[PDB]
Coordinates of C-alpha atoms and ligand atoms in Angstrom, one line a residue:
Chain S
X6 CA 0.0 0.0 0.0
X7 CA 1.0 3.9 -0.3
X8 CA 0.1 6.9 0.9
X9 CA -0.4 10.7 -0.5
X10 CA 0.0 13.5 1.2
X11 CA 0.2 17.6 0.6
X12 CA 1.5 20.8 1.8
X13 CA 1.2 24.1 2.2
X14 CA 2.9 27.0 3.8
X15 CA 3.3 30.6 3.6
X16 CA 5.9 33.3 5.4
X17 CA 5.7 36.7 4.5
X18 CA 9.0 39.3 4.2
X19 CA 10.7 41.4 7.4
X20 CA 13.1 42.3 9.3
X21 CA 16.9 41.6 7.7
X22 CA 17.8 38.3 5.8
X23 CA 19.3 36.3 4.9
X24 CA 17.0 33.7 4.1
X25 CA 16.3 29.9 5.3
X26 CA 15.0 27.5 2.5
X27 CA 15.1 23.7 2.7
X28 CA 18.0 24.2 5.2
X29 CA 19.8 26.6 2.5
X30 CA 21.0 29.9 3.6
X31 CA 20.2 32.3 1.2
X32 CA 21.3 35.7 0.5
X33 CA 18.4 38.4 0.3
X34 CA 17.3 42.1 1.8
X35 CA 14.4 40.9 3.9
X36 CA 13.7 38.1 5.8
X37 CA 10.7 35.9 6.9
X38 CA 8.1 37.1 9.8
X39 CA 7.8 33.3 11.4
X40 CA 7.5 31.7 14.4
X41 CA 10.8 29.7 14.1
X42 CA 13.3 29.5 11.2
X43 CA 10.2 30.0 8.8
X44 CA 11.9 27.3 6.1
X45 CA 8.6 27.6 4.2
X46 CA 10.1 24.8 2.0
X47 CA 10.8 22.3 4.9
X48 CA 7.5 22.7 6.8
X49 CA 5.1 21.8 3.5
X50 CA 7.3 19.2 3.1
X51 CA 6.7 18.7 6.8
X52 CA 2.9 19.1 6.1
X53 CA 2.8 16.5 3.1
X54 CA 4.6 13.7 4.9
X55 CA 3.1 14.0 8.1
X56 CA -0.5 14.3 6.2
X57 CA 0.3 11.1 3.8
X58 CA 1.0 9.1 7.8
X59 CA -2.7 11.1 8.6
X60 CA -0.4 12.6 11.5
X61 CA -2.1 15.8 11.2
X62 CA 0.5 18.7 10.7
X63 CA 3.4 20.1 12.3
X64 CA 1.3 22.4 14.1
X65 CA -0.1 19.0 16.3
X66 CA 2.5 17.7 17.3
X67 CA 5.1 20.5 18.1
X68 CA 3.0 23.2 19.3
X69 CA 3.4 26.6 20.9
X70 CA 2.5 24.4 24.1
X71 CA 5.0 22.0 24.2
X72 CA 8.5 22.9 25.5
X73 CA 10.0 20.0 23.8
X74 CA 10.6 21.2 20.3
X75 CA 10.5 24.9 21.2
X76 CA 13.1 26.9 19.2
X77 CA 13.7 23.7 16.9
X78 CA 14.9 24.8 13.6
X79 CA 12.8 23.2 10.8
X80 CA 15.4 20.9 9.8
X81 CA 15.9 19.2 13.5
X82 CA 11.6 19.0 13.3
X83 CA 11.8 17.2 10.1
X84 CA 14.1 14.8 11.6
X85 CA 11.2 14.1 14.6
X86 CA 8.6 14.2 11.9
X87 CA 10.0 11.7 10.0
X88 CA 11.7 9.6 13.2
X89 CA 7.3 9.3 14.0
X90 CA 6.2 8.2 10.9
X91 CA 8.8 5.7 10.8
X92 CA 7.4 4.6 14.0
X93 CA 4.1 3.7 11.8
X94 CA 5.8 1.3 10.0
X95 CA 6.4 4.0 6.8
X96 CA 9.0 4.9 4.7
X97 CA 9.6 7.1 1.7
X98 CA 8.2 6.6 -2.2
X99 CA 9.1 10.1 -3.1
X100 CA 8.9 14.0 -2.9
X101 CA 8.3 17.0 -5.0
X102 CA 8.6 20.4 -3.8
X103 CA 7.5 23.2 -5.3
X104 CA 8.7 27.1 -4.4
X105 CA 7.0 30.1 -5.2
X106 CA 8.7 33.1 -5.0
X107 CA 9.3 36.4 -7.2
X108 CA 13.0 36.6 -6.3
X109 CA 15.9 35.5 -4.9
X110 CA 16.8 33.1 -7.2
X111 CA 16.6 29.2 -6.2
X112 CA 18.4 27.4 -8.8
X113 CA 22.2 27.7 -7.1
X114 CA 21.2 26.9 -4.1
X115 CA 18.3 23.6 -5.0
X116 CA 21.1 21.4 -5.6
X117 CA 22.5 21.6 -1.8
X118 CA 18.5 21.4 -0.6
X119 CA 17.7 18.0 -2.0
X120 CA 21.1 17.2 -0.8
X121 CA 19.8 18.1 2.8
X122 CA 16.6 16.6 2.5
X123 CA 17.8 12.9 1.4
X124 CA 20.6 12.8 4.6
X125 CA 17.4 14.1 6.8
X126 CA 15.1 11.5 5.0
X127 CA 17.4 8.8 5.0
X128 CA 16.7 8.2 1.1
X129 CA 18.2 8.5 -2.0
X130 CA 18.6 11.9 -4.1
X131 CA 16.3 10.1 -6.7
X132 CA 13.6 10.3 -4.7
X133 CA 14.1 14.1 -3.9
X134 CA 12.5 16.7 -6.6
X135 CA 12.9 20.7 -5.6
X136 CA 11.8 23.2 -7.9
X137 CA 11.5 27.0 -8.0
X138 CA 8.5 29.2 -10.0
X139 CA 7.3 32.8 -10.2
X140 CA 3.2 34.1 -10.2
X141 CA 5.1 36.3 -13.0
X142 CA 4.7 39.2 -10.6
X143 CA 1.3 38.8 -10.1
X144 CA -0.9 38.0 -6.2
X145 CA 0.7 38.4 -3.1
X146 CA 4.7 36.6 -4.3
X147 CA 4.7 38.6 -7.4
X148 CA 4.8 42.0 -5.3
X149 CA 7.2 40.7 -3.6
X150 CA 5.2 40.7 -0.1
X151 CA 6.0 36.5 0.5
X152 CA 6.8 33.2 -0.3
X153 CA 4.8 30.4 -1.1
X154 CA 5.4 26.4 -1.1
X155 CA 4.0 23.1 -1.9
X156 CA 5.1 19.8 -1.4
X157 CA 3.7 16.4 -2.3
X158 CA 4.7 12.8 -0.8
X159 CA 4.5 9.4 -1.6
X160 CA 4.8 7.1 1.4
X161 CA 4.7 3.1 1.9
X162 CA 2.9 1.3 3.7
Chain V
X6 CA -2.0 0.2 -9.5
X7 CA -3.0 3.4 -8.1
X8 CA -4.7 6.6 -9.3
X9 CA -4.0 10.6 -8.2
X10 CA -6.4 13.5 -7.8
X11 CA -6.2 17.0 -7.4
X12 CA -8.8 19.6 -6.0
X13 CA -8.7 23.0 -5.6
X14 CA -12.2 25.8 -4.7
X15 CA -12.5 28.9 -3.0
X16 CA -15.4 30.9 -2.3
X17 CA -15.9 34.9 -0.8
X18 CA -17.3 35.7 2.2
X19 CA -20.6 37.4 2.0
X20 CA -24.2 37.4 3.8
X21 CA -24.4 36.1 7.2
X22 CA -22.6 33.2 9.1
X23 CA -22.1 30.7 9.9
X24 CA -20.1 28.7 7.3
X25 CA -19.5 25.2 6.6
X26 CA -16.8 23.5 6.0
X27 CA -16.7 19.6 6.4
X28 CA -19.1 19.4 7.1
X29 CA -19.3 21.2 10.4
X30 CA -20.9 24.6 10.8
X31 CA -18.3 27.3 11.7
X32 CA -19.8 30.4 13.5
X33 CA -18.7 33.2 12.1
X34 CA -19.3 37.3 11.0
X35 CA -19.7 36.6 7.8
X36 CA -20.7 33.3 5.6
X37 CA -19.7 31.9 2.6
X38 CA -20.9 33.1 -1.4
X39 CA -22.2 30.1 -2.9
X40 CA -24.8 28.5 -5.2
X41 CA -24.0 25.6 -3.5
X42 CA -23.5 25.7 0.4
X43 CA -19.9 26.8 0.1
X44 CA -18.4 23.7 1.8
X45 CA -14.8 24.4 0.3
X46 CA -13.1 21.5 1.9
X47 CA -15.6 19.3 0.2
X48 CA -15.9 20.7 -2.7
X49 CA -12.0 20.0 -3.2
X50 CA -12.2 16.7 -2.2
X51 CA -14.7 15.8 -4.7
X52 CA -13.3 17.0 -7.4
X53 CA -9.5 14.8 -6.4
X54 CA -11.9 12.3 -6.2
X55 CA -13.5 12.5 -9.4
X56 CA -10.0 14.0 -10.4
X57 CA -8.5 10.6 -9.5
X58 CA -11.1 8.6 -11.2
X59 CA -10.9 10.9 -14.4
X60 CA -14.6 11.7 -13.9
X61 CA -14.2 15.1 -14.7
X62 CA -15.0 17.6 -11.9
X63 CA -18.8 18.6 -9.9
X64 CA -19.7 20.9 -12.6
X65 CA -19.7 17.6 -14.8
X66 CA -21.6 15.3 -12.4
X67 CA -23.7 17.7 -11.6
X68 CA -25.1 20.2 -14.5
X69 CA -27.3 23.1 -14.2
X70 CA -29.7 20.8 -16.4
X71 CA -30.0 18.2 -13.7
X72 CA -32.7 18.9 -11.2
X73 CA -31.3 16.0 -9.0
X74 CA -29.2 17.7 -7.2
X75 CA -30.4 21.5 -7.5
X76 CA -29.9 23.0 -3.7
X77 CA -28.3 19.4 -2.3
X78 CA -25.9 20.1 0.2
X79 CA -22.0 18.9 -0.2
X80 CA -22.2 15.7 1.4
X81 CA -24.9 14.5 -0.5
X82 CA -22.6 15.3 -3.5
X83 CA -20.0 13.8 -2.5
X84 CA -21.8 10.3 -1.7
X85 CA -23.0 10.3 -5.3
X86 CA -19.5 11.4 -6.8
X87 CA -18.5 8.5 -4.2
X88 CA -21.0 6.3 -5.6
X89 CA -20.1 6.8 -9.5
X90 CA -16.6 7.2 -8.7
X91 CA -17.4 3.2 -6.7
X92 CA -18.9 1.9 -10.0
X93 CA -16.3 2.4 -11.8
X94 CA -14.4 -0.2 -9.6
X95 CA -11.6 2.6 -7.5
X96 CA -11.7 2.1 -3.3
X97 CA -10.3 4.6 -1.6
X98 CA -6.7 4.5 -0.6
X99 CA -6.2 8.3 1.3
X100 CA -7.3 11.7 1.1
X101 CA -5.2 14.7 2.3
X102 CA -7.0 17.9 2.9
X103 CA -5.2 21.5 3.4
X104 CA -7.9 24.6 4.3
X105 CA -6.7 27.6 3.4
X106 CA -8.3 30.9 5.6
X107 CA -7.1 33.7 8.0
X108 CA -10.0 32.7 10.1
X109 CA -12.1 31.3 12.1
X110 CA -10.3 28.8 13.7
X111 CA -11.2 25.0 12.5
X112 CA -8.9 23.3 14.4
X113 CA -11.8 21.9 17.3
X114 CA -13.8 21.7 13.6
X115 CA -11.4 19.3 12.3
X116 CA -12.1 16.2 14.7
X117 CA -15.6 16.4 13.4
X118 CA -15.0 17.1 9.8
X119 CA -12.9 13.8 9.1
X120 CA -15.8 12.4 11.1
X121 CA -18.2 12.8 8.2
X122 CA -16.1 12.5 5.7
X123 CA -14.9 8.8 7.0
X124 CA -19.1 7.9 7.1
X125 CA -19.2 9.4 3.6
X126 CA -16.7 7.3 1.6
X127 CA -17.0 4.2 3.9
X128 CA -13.1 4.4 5.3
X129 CA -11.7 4.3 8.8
X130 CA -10.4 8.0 9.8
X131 CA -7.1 6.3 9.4
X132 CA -7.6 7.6 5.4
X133 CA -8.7 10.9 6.0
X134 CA -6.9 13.6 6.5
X135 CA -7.8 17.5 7.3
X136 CA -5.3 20.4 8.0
X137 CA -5.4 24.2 8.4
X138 CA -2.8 26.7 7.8
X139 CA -2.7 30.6 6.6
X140 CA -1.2 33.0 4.5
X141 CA 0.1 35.4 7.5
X142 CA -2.2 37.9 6.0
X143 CA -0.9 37.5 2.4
X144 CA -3.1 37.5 -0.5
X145 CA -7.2 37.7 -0.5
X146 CA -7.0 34.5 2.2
X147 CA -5.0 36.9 4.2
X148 CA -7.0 40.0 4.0
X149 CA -9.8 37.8 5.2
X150 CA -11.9 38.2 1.3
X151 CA -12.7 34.5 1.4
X152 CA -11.5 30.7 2.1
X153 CA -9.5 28.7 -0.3
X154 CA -8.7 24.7 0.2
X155 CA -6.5 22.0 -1.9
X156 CA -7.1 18.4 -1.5
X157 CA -5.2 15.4 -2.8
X158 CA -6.8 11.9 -3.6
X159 CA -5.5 8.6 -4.1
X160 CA -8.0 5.7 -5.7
X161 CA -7.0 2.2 -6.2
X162 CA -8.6 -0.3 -8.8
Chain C
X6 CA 6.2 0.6 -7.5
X7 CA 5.1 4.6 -8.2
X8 CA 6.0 8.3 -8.4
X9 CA 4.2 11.2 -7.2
X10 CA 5.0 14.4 -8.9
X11 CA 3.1 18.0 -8.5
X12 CA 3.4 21.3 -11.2
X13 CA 2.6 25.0 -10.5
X14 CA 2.5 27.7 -13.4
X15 CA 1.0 31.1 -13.6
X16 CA 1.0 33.7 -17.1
X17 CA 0.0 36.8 -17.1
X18 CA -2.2 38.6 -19.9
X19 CA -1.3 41.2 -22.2
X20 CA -1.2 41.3 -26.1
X21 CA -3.7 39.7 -28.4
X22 CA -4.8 36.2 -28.1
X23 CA -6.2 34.2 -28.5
X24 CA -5.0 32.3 -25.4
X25 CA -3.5 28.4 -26.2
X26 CA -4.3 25.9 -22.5
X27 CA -3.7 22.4 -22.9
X28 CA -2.6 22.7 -26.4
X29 CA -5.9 24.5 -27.8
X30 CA -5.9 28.1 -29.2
X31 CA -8.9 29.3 -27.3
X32 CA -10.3 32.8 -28.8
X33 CA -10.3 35.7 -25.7
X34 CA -10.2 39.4 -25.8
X35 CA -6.3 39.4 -24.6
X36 CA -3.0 36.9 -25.0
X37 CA -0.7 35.5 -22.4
X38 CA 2.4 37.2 -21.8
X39 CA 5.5 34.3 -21.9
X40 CA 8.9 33.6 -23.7
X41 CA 7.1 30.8 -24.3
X42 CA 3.5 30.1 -26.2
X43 CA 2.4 30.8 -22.5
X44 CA 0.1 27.4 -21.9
X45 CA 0.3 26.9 -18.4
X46 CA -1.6 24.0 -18.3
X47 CA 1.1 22.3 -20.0
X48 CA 3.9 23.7 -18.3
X49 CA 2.2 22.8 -14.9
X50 CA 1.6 19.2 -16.1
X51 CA 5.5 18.9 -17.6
X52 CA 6.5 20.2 -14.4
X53 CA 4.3 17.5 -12.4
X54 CA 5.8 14.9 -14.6
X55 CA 9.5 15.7 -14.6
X56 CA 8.8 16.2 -10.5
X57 CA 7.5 12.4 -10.6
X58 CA 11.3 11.9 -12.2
X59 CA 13.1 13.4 -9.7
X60 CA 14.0 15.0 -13.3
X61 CA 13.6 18.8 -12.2
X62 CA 11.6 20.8 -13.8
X63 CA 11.4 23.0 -17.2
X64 CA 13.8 25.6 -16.2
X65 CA 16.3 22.9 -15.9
X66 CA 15.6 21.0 -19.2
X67 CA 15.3 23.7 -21.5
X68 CA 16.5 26.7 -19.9
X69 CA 15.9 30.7 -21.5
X70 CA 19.7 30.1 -21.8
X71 CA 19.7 27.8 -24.9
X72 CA 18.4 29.5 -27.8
X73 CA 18.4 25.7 -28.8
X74 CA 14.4 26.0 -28.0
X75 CA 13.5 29.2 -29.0
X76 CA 10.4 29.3 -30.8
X77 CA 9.2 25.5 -29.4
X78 CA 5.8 25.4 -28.0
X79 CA 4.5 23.6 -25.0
X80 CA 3.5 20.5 -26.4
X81 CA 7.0 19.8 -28.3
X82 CA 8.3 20.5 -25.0
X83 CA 6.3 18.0 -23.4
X84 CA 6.6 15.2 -25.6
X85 CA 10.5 16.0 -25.5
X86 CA 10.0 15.7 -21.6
X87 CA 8.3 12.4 -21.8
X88 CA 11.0 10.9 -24.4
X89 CA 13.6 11.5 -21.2
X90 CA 11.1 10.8 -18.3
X91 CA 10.2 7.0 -20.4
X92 CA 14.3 6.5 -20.9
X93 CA 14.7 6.8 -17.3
X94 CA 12.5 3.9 -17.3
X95 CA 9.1 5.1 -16.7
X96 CA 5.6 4.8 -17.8
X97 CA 2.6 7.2 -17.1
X98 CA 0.0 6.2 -14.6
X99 CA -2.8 9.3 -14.4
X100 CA -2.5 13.3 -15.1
X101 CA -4.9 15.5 -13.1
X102 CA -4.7 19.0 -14.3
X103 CA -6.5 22.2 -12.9
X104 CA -7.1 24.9 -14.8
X105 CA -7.5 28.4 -12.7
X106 CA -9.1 31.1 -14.7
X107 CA -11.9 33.9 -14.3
X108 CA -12.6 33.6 -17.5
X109 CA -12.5 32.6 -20.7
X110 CA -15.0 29.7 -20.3
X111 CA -13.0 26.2 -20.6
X112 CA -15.4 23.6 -21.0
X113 CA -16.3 23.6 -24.6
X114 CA -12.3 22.8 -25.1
X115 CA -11.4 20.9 -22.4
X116 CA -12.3 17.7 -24.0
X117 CA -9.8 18.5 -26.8
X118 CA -7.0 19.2 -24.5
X119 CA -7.3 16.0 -22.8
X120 CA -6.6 14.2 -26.3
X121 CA -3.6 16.4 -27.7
X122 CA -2.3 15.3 -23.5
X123 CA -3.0 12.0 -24.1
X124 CA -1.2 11.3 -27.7
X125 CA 1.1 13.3 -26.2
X126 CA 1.6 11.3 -23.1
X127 CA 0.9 8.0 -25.3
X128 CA -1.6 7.1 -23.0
X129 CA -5.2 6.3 -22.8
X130 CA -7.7 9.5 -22.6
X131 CA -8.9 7.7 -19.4
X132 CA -5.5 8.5 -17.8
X133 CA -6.0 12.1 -18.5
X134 CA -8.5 14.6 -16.4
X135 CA -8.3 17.9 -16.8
X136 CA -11.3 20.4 -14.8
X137 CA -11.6 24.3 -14.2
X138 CA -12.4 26.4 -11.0
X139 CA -12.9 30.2 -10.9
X140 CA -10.8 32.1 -7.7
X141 CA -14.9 33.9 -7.7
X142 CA -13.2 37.4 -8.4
X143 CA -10.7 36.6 -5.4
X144 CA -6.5 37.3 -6.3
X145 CA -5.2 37.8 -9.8
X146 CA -7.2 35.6 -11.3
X147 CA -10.3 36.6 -9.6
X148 CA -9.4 40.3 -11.2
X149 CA -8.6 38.4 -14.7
X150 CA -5.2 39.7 -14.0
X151 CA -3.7 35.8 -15.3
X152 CA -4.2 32.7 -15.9
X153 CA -2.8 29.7 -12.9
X154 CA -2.8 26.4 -12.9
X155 CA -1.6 23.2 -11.2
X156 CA -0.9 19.7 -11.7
X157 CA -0.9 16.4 -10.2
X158 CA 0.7 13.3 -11.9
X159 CA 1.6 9.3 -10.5
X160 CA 4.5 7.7 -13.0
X161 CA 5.0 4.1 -12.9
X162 CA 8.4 2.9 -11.8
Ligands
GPP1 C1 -2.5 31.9 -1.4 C2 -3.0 31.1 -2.6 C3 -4.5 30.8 -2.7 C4 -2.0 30.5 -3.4 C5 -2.3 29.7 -4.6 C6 -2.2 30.6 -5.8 C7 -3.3 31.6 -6.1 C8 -4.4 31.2 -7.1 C9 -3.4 32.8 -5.4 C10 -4.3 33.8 -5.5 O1 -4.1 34.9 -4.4 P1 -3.3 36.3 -4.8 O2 -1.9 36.1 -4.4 O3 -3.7 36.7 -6.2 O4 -3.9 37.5 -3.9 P2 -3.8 39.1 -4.3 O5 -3.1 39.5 -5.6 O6 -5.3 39.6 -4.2 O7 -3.0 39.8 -3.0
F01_2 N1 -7.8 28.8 9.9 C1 -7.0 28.2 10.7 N2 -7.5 27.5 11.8 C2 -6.6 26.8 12.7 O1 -7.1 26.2 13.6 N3 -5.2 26.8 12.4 C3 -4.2 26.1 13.3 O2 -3.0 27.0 13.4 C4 -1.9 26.1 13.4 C5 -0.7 26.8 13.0 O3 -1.0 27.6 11.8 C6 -2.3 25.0 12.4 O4 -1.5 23.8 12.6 C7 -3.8 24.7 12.8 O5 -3.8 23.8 13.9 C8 -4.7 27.5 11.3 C9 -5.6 28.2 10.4 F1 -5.1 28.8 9.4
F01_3 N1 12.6 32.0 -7.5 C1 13.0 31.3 -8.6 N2 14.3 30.8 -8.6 C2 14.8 30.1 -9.7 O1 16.0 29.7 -9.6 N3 14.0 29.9 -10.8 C3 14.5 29.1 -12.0 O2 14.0 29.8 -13.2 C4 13.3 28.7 -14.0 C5 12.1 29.4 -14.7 O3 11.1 29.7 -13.8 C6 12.9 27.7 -13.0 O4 12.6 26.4 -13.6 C7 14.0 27.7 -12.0 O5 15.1 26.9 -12.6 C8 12.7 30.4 -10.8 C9 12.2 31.1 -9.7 F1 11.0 31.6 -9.8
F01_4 N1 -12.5 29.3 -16.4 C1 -13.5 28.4 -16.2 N2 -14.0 27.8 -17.3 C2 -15.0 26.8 -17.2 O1 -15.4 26.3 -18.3 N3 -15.5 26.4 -16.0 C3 -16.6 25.4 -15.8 O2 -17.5 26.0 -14.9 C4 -17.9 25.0 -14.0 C5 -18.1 25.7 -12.6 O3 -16.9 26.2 -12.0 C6 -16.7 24.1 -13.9 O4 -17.1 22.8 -13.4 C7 -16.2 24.1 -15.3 O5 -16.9 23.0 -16.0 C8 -14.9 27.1 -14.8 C9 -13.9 28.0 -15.0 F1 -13.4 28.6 -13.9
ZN5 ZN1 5.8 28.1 8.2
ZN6 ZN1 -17.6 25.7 -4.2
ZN7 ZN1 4.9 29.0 -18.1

C-alpha cells in the first residue's frame, strides 16, 4: 500500500535576511516574519509527509505548548517528523517540492536542498525533486510581499 | 495500481454566518458566497476524487440541467461522486485535505469534519486527512476576502 | 512501485490572443504574456511529470539560456520531456490537471485538450483529467489579471 499527502505553507518578508529555505541559507534584503526558522520549503514538506501518515500537521505535534521542540529549527523537526512516521511502520516513495517566489533566485542553491533533504530523510537523491517558479509578478509573491510552497509525498505502507 | 487526484475551490465571504466546511458549521461574521452551500473543503475533495477517477469535476456530475441535485448540500454530493466514482471499480486508498483561511479557527472543527467525511466514503479515519494553515495575512486569504482549500486523492482499482 | 509528482505555473495577460491551454488556441479578448506560447496548463503538467522523475523541472531541461528551443511550443516541450522521463524507465499512470481562470469559459475545449495530452503522453484518454475552477473574483485571477494552474501526476516505476 501507499500513501499521498500535501503541503502548504506561507511566510511573508521582514526584518533583515538572509533567508532559510530547505536548510539553505540564502542571500536576500528581507527576511521571513515566522515563528521559528520560517523554512517555508521544509515545513510543506513537513505538512505532506506528516498528512500522507494522517499525522495531522506540524502544528499538532510541536506546538506553541510544548517545550520539547521549542526553538527547533525546521530541519531538526523534520528529523522528529520523519523519526514518527517511521514509527508507523512507513517509509519514503518520493517527494516534489515546489517554491513560489518572485525573487531571490533558487536554482544555485536547489542542488544543496535536495542534498539536505535525502541525509534528513534517509533516502536517495532520486527520490528528492525541488523546484522554484514565479506568479510572473502577479498576487501576493509577485509584489514581492511572500513566499509560497507546496510539497507532495508518496509514502509506503 | 493506483490513481492521483487533485482539488482546488475557493469561495468569498458574504451574507451572514455561519459557514460550513466539512461538514461542520463554523460560526462566524460573515458566511460563505455560494450556489452551493460553500463547503470548500468538500468541494475539493470531490473533485480529487472524481479527479482521480478521471470523472471530470462537480460541474460535470452535476449540471445546471440536472434537477437531481439542485440545492443538495455537499455531502450529499459527495456520496453520489462516491458512488459513480465506486462503480467504476476505485476504493479509496487516502485523502489529504489542506484549508486555506485567515479565520475562524477550525482546528476543534477538524475532529468532526474527518468524522463525516470517514461515514461518507466508507473508510476508517485512518484515510482521511484535514489540516489548516494561513497566509500570515498575504493575498485575499489573508486580508480575510474568502477561504481557499487543496485536497489530494488517491483511488486504487 | 510509483512516483508522485506536483506542477505549479502562472502567465500573465497582455497582447492579443487568443490564449492556447492544454494545447488549444482558445479565442479571448487578450494573450498571455511568456517567452514561451504561455500554456500553463502544460507547463504545470510537464512540471508535475518531470517532479515524478526526480528530473527537475522546465527551467532545468530547457533553460531561457539555450536559444536551442526558441520558438518550441508547449506541447513539443512536453513530448520532449516524456522521451527523457520513459528513458529513465518510466511509464505514465494518471495526469490531473486544474485549470485556474476567471474567464474565458474552458469547458467547450477541455475535451480536446485531454486528447492532444494523451497522444502526447501516449496514453489512454482515461489516464487524462483535466477540470476548471474560478478564484470567484478573489487574487489575480479573480481580477482576470492571469491565468494559474496546477498539476498532479503518478509515473510508474
Ligand atoms: C494563497 C494562494 C491561494 C495561493 C495559490 C495561488 C493563487 C491562485 C493565489 C491567489 O491569491 P493572490 O496572491 O492573487 O492575492 P492578491 O493579488 O489579491 O493579493
Ligand atoms: N484557519 C486556521 N485554523 C486553525 O485552527 N489553524 C491552526 O493553526 C496552526 C498553525 O498555523 C495550524 O496547525 C492549525 O492547527 C490555522 C488556520 F489557518
Ligand atoms: N525563484 C526562482 N528561482 C529560480 O531559480 N527559478 C528558475 O527559473 C526557471 C524558470 O522559472 C525555474 O525552472 C528555475 O530553474 C525560478 C524562480 F521563480
Ligand atoms: N474558467 C473556467 N471555465 C469553465 O469552463 N469552468 C466550468 O465552470 C464550472 C463551474 O466552475 C466548472 O465545473 C467548469 O466546467 C470554470 C472556470 F473557472
Ligand atoms: Zn511556516
Ligand atoms: Zn464551491
Ligand atoms: Zn509557463
Amino acid at each position: 500500500e501507499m500513501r499521498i499527502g500535501h503541503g502548504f505553507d506561507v511566510h511573508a518578508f521582514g526584518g533583515e535576511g538572509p533567508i532559510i529555505i530547505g536548510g539553505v541559507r540564502i542571500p536576500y534584503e528581507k527576511g521571513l516574519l515566522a515563528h521559528s526558522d520560517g523554512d517555508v520549503a521544509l515545513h510543506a514538506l513537513t505538512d505532506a509527509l506528516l498528512g500522507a501518515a494522517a499525522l495531522g500537521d506540524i502544528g499538532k505535534l510541536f506546538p506553541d505548548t510544548d517545550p520539547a521542540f521549542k526553538g527547533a529549527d525546521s530541519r531538526e523537526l523534520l528529523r522528529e517528523a520523519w523519526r514518527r512516521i517511521q514509527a508507523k511502520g512507513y517509509t519514503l516513495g518520493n517527494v516534489d517540492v515546489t517554491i513560489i517566489a518572485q525573487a531571490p533566485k533558487m536554482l544555485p542553491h536547489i542542488p544543496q536542498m535536495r542534498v539536505f533533504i535525502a541525509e534528513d530523510l534517509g533516502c536517495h537523491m532520486d527520490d528528492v525533486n525541488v523546484k522554484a517558479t514565479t506568479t510572473e509578478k502577479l498576487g501576493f509573491t509577485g509584489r514581492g510581499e511572500g513566499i509560497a510552497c507546496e510539497a507532495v509525498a508518496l509514502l509506503i505502507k
